[PDB]
Amino acid sequence: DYTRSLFTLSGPATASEVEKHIQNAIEFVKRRDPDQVQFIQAFTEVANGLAPVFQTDLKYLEIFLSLSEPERVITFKVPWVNDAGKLMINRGFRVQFNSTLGPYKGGLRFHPSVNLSILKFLGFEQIFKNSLTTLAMGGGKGGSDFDPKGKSDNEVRSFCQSFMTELQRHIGPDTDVPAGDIGVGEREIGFMYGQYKRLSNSSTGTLTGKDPKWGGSFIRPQATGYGLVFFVQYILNDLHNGDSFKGKRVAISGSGNVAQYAADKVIDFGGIPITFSDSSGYIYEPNGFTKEMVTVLMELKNIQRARVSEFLKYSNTAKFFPNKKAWDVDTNVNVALPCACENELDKADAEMLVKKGCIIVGEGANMPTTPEAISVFKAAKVTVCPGKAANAGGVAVSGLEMSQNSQREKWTSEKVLEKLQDIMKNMSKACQEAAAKYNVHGDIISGANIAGFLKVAHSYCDQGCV
Amino acid sequence: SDYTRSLFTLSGPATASEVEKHIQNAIEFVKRRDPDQVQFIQAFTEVANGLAPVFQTDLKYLEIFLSLSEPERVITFKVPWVNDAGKLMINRGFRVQFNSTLGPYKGGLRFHPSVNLSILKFLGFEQIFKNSLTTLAMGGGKGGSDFDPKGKSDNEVRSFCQSFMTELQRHIGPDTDVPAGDIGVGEREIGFMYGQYKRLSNSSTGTLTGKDPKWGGSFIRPQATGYGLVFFVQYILNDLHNGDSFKGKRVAISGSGNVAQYAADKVIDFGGIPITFSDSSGYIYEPNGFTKEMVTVLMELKNIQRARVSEFLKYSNTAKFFPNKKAWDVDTNVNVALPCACENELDKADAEMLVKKGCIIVGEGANMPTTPEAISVFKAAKVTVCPGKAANAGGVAVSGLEMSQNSQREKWTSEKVLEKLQDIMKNMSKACQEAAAKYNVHGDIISGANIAGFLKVAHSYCDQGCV
Amino acid sequence: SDYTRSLFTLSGPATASEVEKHIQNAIEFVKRRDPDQVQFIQAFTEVANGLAPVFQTDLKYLEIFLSLSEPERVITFKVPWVNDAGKLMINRGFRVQFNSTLGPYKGGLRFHPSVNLSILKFLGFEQIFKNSLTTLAMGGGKGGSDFDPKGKSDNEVRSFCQSFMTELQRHIGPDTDVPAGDIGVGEREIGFMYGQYKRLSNSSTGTLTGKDPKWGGSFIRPQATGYGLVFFVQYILNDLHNGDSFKGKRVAISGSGNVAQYAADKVIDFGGIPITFSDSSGYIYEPNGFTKEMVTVLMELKNIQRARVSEFLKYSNTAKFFPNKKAWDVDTNVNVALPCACENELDKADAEMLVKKGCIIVGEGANMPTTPEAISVFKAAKVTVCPGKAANAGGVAVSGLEMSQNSQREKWTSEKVLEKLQDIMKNMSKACQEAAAKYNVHGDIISGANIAGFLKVAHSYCDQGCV
Amino acid sequence: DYTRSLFTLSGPATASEVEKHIQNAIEFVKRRDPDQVQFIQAFTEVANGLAPVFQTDLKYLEIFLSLSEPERVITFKVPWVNDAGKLMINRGFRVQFNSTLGPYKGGLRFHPSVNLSILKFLGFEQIFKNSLTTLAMGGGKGGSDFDPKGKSDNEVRSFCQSFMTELQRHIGPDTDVPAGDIGVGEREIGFMYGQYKRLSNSSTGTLTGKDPKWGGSFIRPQATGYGLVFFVQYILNDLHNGDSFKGKRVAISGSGNVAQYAADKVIDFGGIPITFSDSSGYIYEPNGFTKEMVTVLMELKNIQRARVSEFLKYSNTAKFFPNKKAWDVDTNVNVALPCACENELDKADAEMLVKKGCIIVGEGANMPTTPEAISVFKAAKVTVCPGKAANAGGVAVSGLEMSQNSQREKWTSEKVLEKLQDIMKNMSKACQEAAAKYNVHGDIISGANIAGFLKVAHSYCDQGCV
Ligand code: NA
């Protein structure tokens, strides 16, 4: 330790002392930004998750507070002319929160609800999510209150070009590599890359989510679903004494890209997917979905945009249960993978799953499991894999896109998948060891919180706390 | 001509009631974008209401005004520094680069614990039109930090200033953004920040104003605001009071800082007598006026000894002190009132006394000294009010002259700087009158200053394609 | 002294016949390098022939001249932009950076469908020596696009200007290349391009001239070329016609644009009487001359209504109109002819009438107005011809004064700019006479302008190592 | 040959003629820098070592003289404030000696003895040492007369930040990549990286020796000691007819990272390390150090900062000999590894090792063996592995750190170790082949000098001698 003298708070502390210090830190965050509700909530949640670390050494709470101030925030006017010839002014943002582990990394959101508080909350959390990938990536977030909905393609191009005319000044392949998010998909990434390239007169990996013809990476559509299965597989080996997906009945909720590619990789590991779901209900195959059946489901949902119920016209064994969740299926379920939406698995759902024998839950979606549902799982000793780690496959592959751009070499699909699998392996071990080191063995949720923070905190001190 | 007409949705003349509703719509839009920036919202409201005569001629100006209210760029940044105890401190730094249509972003830096984005946006937005009025090619901006200089050692201020400029230097430059001093940022801080900027940039340029005259600074900088106030009132007296001047005028001055002191000196130069100075303890009064020698004595008490104005009674047998009273209460005739102390220092009752005491004109040395009720009293009495937005702009005008001297790599004599400052205030006073007359508020110099400052920016913004 | 002698293969004096063959070999070399650039080849040929007296004293000047004929840098670029219908349009943009020996590249931008590299190289090459003649530290350049502004909306011109400057900004700068206006690039386009340059560079500098006075522009810009023409002719009359002046002179002016209008204004200031203006439709004639009040009316018709000169007869009871005739046909005594309309507007037949009507001097406001046959007639008649390369350089002279004001961050009064323009034209007229006298072509101001412009560049090129 | 016309001296020359030309070159160097004793001595030693090359073509002597002038030297004021609040001014340096093969590369030294002569001497040799690694790296060296002794962590932080505030202007990932040296370890690299990152607003490999959490490489602490053992192992196989470290008693001098990890790799190859030494004396184990014993010694020297005599408290069989060198130990020695300091092995010590049966010497430190000692070994037929190649493992791994940074990909420890071993293998072959090509067969010292020089000399001419 070469930075000990810099910190006012140091040494061990009791749980009650840490609770008081956390509340003091929260009040300090509030006084600095009294009306940033989302950011304040995010700081409070992450701080509470790190209480075991703060008890061992109070310096970590100070570092946490120091990390809570963005290194740089750029807000800028974005003038653009709509198709009617009228000048429009929108607000643009790039929160460059932390660059300790690498260049600022995080998506861009174009949505009318976007403001500084929301981007700070997402950007702050992205620091530790990117940390967990093991890759050299910092944390950031940006976007605009520009609303793409109802706008023509030309209007989106006009906005993307004017937005990037300013953003290019603050980003770069070794500085800040933004990505997509709500309102920023392939269309917007492409428009922004063209403008960035024209202004910079350079072809670099300054954005991720690019098309494979010009710097993009394979496995991007599959990354999140595959990464979820990888993480759960490695947790089963590392925390369930050599257990595996093999022979496991896998109940999957959702019918989107995450659920589809999660089911494929489960079958690759010898598991049996038995359910898919949408807002209309869930479908169930007693003997599981084959890959060929998953392929049929993909075209119905992706091309025909149909409901899951249409699948029964293709399988004679398929059953459809209207207005029910996948957790209601009357069979034994060994693994539950919520891959649909937030708070989709509640206390009642968790109780059913425990009664049906599920040994582990993997969060494919964002915050799928309610806090009450988590409590039942902890009592039942059912492992919960946190989404911040289990669904990090997308950001992991965004880092692999940077590697390919830095190497000016496009990897084969097999190679990208191999490194994604290695990333989830190292991430799962880091979460387990972190939980064990702080005497919350098996609490992967705590392990993910600790592992992400500590790599940033220690690197911050290595670099002189600047 | 008009090459940007097609870009604006609102256009054409509008009635007074219609303009009132449109302004209210504009305010609501500003509120939704920044719902809790109280100071910025009110600043937008005040300036918008002051421009209603313009909006009635063409609603396009309201849309331009709304467009100008969004900063071109805001940079907020972490400022880590180590205090004398060896402990790491983190403060928030800001630079609001609001508008650069007329020139590089220009505006002071404030180091005070109350600093936040709303306050800096309010000051920076207003700085656009203040700098416009100087006739010089300067934009508008404002920055600073919630760093609290109170209780800090010189070394800690040095450490913070160097870390603050380590990030700020990346966003400023002699042709880009030229910051200056403000509350908490004086000669000490400007010097510390200039040293760091020079070291990192490996260049010697006019990237800050307020520099010492030994390395790029300008003469007349301490005197600029007080002199400029007297110049402006002098020119208004000539043009709107039929050749009147400061000659023979009894001038009640509030405040005892640099603005009040150098305004007093210039009043004497123009043949008037300053009769009062004041601070929080009260006001002092000389029935036959303060001489330049007496003003110098009072300066030493306030600037070196940091004493109260009452101390002056030890030096003058004729001086009278009135505790806990404002200078407007002085029991004598007052022809010119120059509020140079603080906001809302001249209220409705004060305006009424001054009218009865023979006041013909008010020159605002401080910011918003005269309350709205006081302004109504003066307009009914036909007492001219010279708005602070123009009358106290002498300081920023000389900061622009500092930039000119740096760009020319030539230090002007004090006489040359003083002449150009006087010429600036002359053209500014004429622009305010002409704007007021053109929009049928003849003699309303408050409206004229609002209009003249806004229109030069709005028209140049359209010339440049509204980018 | 001479430190670059060893670098040149050709050196020493040569006979007139030897120079003729050397010039042809130089021309053949230029043709082989650019065989189809007709305008550039002819421009090189004309200037080379005008410099034959110099080449005879030392053939190295021919080698220097040939070296100068290759641009230091030419940038051609695609300009994609979206029209009001939403359709992608691609035009070609150019910037010919011909020579920077005396200072940053300087020259206008032309937006016209006929624009190509040959035309821009011809104009840019001549711009080197024209800017040289102003005495100011300016190089030579030219740029533009085949974009056709006619039929385009203001918004479409804005889109093109912004896309055009998005690439051009990468190659220009206040100390590198300062473009200006030309055909198709006026106040609208300069403003649009300035906005885009400012946003991308994040700086406020004098990287374009022709700006509006509210943001870095200069007074006297509209009047500069017309005023400069009259200044130049006035000095030539004093120096070569034994103290003669514009006083009492009847001046036939061709054209009705800004050059002719402000030339007429300055003639009246000097006591002259302008008697004609002309258009594509014909010419108008006032027997007793146009007063400034009358010129003001013509300005409104031509600049605001953009009507033809025949409209003037509705306002003057004495005005006469002659369709399909040039102003030189006017039936009266003519003492001064000022062609300010177009190339080859004054032919041999026109010159003979003007001599018969008593013309003592011709001043070229336009470019190449006088045909080669017409020049011979005037030389035989001993009527002085003031070359356009010097006489119409007032515009570029003031563009240089705009750069000085930007570099100084100080706007000059109109009086100061006018005084400096007049002094420039005085030194230029002296430079042309002295250069002509030194090479034994006394009184040939056309050759004097060629020689004086070339030599300052040629000598400085050698000072700088011929790089 | 496209640069022949540029050189005044050319063609073959007799041995006596080469000696006269070398002496003129030395005098020319002296007149240019009459008081830079170390630099003059370094130029003289290398020039004499390259005499066989100069005899084949005198242009090489002219190239060598041309290389002796640095491309660029930046010396600069370094102002910083100590913990008492007092302004201190130190001198900073960066000698950017040659960039023919790649960006300037070399360590930074913070020590009160530092001056221009020492840095030119170290930087000049660094050119050819880096050449031998086969990696695309130039040569340089820098530092300051700042004395870390007696300074607090914060004072070192203050100096490092001010030092990098100027240095950052002259370095970069493709221009100059500094590294550590005496007085510049993990603490200083971390502090300087933090300052460089903040000022440049970028995350790149502009320093090596970084921590693996942010751009660092595995095997970096072990690289020089491991590389020394790899090199000697290959020389034993190639020049001692298939011999190896197995069963060899290895006397190691020094107790720093080089000596510790050299002992570690010796044990991997079946050898027996018997001694360690420091300024206080040397310790001796009759039956050798095990890895557990080396692990204890590492903790004493690296954490406790104690003298080697402390080891006797943990091993009953260890012996301590005050104020004596490890070469005096009374036993048979098969391999000598001087890994402590310059001129640590003198003529008398070499005589003892020959008497005790030493068959090969591996130079871990810089210039460890005196010229008199080298003569003893050459007469005795004891092979000397030159430090210029044998201790280049550290700079080799610093090049692998650069590759990983340029690839934005962290290699496994196994991958780094194999590439280090392959580099040392090719280097040992290059030294033998170069010595053979210039008819000094078996003179590995001469071979290392020739192989490093020729790649730079030929590449310099390829690039127009600019
Ligand atoms: Na790379």
What HEC string does chain C produce? CCCCHHHCCCCCCCCHHHHHHHHHHHHHHHHHHCCCCHHHHHHHHHHHHHCHHHHHHCCHHHHHHHHHCCCCEEEEEEEEEECCCCCEEEEEEEEEEEECCCCCEEEEEEECCCCCHHHHHHHHHHHHHHHHHCCCCCCEEEEEECCCCCCCCHHHHHHHHHHHHHHHHHHCECCCEEEECECCECHHHHHHHHHHHHHHHCCCCCCCCCCCHHHCCCCCCCCHHHHHHHHHHHHHHHHHCCCCCCCCCEEEEECCCHHHHHHHHHHHHCCCEEEEEECCCEEEECCCCCCHHHHHHHHHHHHHHCCCHHHHHHCCCCCEEEECCCHHHCCCCCCEEEECCCCCCECHHHHHHHHHCCCCEEECCCCCCECHHHHHHHHHHCCEEECHHHHCCHHHHHHHHHHHHHHHCCCCCHHHHHHHHHHHHHHHHHHHHHHHHHCCCCCCHHHHHHHHHHHHHHHHHHHCCCC
CA-wise closest residue to B200 among C80, D200, D383? D200
**Binding-site residue set of B:** 106, 127, 130, 181, 225, 258, 399
Tell me, yes or no, if B137 comes closer than 8 A to chain D by beta carbon.
no
Q: In this structure, are residues D59 and D7 in contact, taking their beta carbons and an 8 Å threshold? A: yes
Residue B140 vs residues A462, B177, B187: alpha-carbon distances, Å: 40, 9, 21
Q: Using DSSP bridges, classify how beta strands A139-144 and A176-179 pair: parallel, antiparallel or unpaired.
A: unpaired
In chain D, the N- to C-terminal Cα span, in Å, equals 16
- How far off is chain B from C175, nearest CA to CA, in Å? 13
Inter-axis angle of helices D413-437 and D393-407, to 10 degrees? 130
Classified as helix, coil or strand, D19 is helix
| Amino acid letter, A230 | F
Q: In this structure, are residues C239 and C430 in contact, taking their beta carbons and an 8 Å threshold? A: yes
Contact A72 B67 (CB under 8 A): no
Q: In this structure, are residues B363 and B388 in contact, taking their beta carbons and an 8 Å threshold? A: no
- How far off is chain A from B317, nearest CA to CA, in Å? 52
| Structural tokens at position C234 | 């006035």
CA-wise closest residue to B143 among B85, B198, B182, B187? B182
How many helices (H) does chain B have, and how many strands (E)? 16, 12
User: How would you class A232 by CB atoms within 10 Å of its CB: exposed for 0-12, middle for 13-18, buried for 19 or more?
Assistant: buried
Q: How far apart are CA D352 and CA D51, in angstroms?
A: 31
Q: Using DSSP bridges, classify how beta strands D335-338 and B73-82 pair: parallel, antiparallel or unpaired.
A: unpaired
Q: Which residues contact B356 (CB under 8 A, 6 or more apart)?
A: none
Q: How far apart are CA C193 and CA C189, in angstroms?
A: 6
Q: In this structure, are residues B288 and B319 in contact, taking their beta carbons and an 8 Å threshold? A: no
Q: In this structure, are residues A420 and A230 in contact, taking their beta carbons and an 8 Å threshold? A: yes
Q: How far apart are CA D190 and CA A1, in angstroms?
A: 12
Q: In this structure, are residues A296 and A223 in contact, taking their beta carbons and an 8 Å threshold? A: no
| Structural tokens at position A207 | 């954005």
Mutate to test the interface with C, among B2, B3, B100, B420 (most CBs of C within 10 A): B3
- How many of the other CB atoms lie within 10 Å of CB of C24? 12
Please name every residue paired with B90 in a beta bridge, in sequence order, or none if there are none. Answer: B80
Residue C115 vs residues C32, C105, C110, C163, D297: alpha-carbon distances, Å: 22, 19, 7, 18, 81
Please report the sign of the dihedral spanned by the C-alpha atoms of residue C15, residue C20, residue C24, residue C26: positive
Tell me, yes or no, if B90 comes closer than 8 A to chain D by beta carbon.
no
Chain B residue at shortest CA distance from C406: B407
| Structural tokens at position B273 | 């007598």
CA-wise closest residue to D433 among D285, D265, D234, D245? D234
- How many of the other CB atoms lie within 10 Å of CB of A58? 20
The CA D405 to ligand 1 mean position distance, Å, reads: 7
Q: How far apart are CA B365 and CA B362, in angstroms?
A: 9
Q: How far apart are CA B383 and CA B336, in angstroms?
A: 10
Chains C and D lie in contact, requiring 3 or more CB pairs less than 8 Å apart = no
Q: Give the neighbor-by-neighbor strand order of the sheet with B282-285.
A: B320-323, B282-285, B273-279, B250-254, B336-339, B361-363, B384-386
CA-wise closest residue to C433 among C186, C298, C237? C237
In chain B, the N- to C-terminal Cα span, in Å, equals 18
Q: How far apart are CA C464 and CA D102, in angstroms?
A: 34
Q: How far apart are CA B81 and CA B87, in angstroms?
A: 8
- How far off is chain B from A334, nearest CA to CA, in Å? 48
Q: In this structure, are residues C190 and C162 in contact, taking their beta carbons and an 8 Å threshold? A: no
Q: How far apart are CA C329 and CA C346, in angstroms?
A: 11
List the beta strands (DSSP E) in B83-196. Answer: 88-99, 105-111, 140-145, 177-180
Q: How far apart are CA A236 and CA D257, in angstroms?
A: 39
Classified as helix, coil or strand, D362 is strand
Q: Which residues contact D211 (CB under 8 A, 6 or more apart)?
A: A459, A462, D186, D189, D190
Chains A and B lie in contact, requiring 3 or more CB pairs less than 8 Å apart = yes
Q: In this structure, are residues C174 and C201 in contact, taking their beta carbons and an 8 Å threshold? A: no
Residue A373 vs residues A347, A362, B434, C178: alpha-carbon distances, Å: 4, 13, 73, 69
Q: How far apart are CA A98 and CA A395, in angstroms?
A: 16
Residue B271 vs residues B235, B249, B295, B337: alpha-carbon distances, Å: 14, 8, 15, 16
Contact B73 A69 (CB under 8 A): no
Q: How far apart are CA D176 and CA D170, in angstroms?
A: 7
Q: Which residues contact C27 (CB under 8 A, 6 or more apart)?
A: C41, C44, C45, C48
Classified as helix, coil or strand, D239 is helix
Tell me, yes or no, if D150 comes closer than 8 A to chain B by beta carbon.
no
- Any chains having at least 3 CB pairs less than 8 A from chain A are B, C, D
Assign 3-class secondary structure to A48-93: HHCHHHHHHCCHHHHHHHHHCCCCEEEEEEEEEECCCCCEEEEEEE
Please report the sign of the dihedral spanned by the C-alpha atoms of residue C412, residue C414, residue C416, residue C419: positive
Q: Which residue has the tokens 């060994």?
A: A334
% helix / strand / coil in chain B, to the nearest 5?
Answer: 50, 15, 35
Residue B124 vs residues A116, B104, B120, B454: alpha-carbon distances, Å: 20, 13, 6, 14
| Structural tokens at position C86 | 């939403």
| Structural tokens at position C127 | 């711009």
| Structural tokens at position A99 | 């660059």
Residue D460 vs residues B351, C89, C138, D12, D451: alpha-carbon distances, Å: 85, 49, 41, 20, 14
| Structural tokens at position D180 | 């550590």
Q: How far apart are CA B188 and CA D310, in angstroms?
A: 55
Residues of C known to be catalytic: 142
User: How would you class B45 by CB atoms within 10 Å of its CB: exposed for 0-12, middle for 13-18, buried for 19 or more?
Assistant: middle
Q: How far apart are CA A91 and CA A75, in angstroms?
A: 7
Cα diameter, chain B:
70
CA-wise closest residue to A46 among A131, A134, A136? A131
Q: What is the DSSP letter of B318?
A: S
Classified as helix, coil or strand, B236 is helix
Give Rg (Cα) of chain C: 22
Please name every residue paired with C140 in a beta bridge, in sequence order, or none if there are none. Answer: C99
Tell me the chain B residues in contact with residue C199 when contact means C-beta distances shorter than 8 Å.
467
| Structural tokens at position B281 | 């303890």
Tell me, yes or no, if D83 comes closer than 8 A to chain B by beta carbon.
yes
Q: In this structure, are residues D379 and D351 in contact, taking their beta carbons and an 8 Å threshold? A: no
Residue A24 vs residues A20, A56, A117, A444, B145: alpha-carbon distances, Å: 6, 18, 20, 27, 22
Tell me the chain A residues in contact with residue D153 when contact means C-beta distances shorter than 8 Å.
2-5
Q: In this structure, are residues C114 and C148 in contact, taking their beta carbons and an 8 Å threshold? A: no
CA-wise closest residue to C224 among C273, C262, C270, C269? C262
Q: Which residue has the tokens 């230097």?
A: B169
| Structural tokens at position C318 | 């004495």
Q: How far apart are CA A204 and CA A196, in angstroms?
A: 10
Q: How far apart are CA C448 and CA C450, in angstroms?
A: 5
Q: How far apart are CA D186 and CA C197, in angstroms?
A: 46
CA-wise closest residue to A401 among A206, A264, A253, A267? A206
CA-wise closest residue to A5 among D187, B155, B162? D187
User: Helix H segments across A168-222?
Assistant: 186-200
Which residues, numbered 13 to 32 in chain C, qualify as contacts with chain A under a Cβ-Cβ cut-off of 8 Å? none
Chain B residue at shortest CA distance from A10: B87
CA-wise closest residue to D67 among D29, D33, D116? D29
Residues of D known to be catalytic: 141
Q: How far apart are CA A125 and CA A133, in angstroms?
A: 13
Inter-axis angle of helices C60-68 and C16-33, to 10 degrees? 20
- How far off is chain A from C90, nearest CA to CA, in Å? 15
List the beta strands (DSSP E) in B101-259. Answer: 105-111, 140-145, 177-180, 250-254
User: How would you class D18 by CB atoms within 10 Å of its CB: exposed for 0-12, middle for 13-18, buried for 19 or more?
Assistant: buried
Q: How far apart are CA A46 and CA A60, in angstroms?
A: 13
Q: How far apart are CA B390 and CA B131, in angstroms?
A: 9
Contact D85 B84 (CB under 8 A): yes
Q: Using DSSP bridges, classify how beta strands A319-322 and A281-284 pair: parallel, antiparallel or unpaired.
A: antiparallel
Q: Which residue has the tokens 């009759």?
A: D286
Please name every residue paired with D289 in a beta bridge, in sequence order, or none if there are none. Answer: none
Mutate to test the interface with B, among A28, A89, A167, A465 (most CBs of B within 10 A): A89
Total residues belonging to chain D: 466
% helix / strand / coil in chain D, to the nearest 5?
Answer: 50, 15, 35
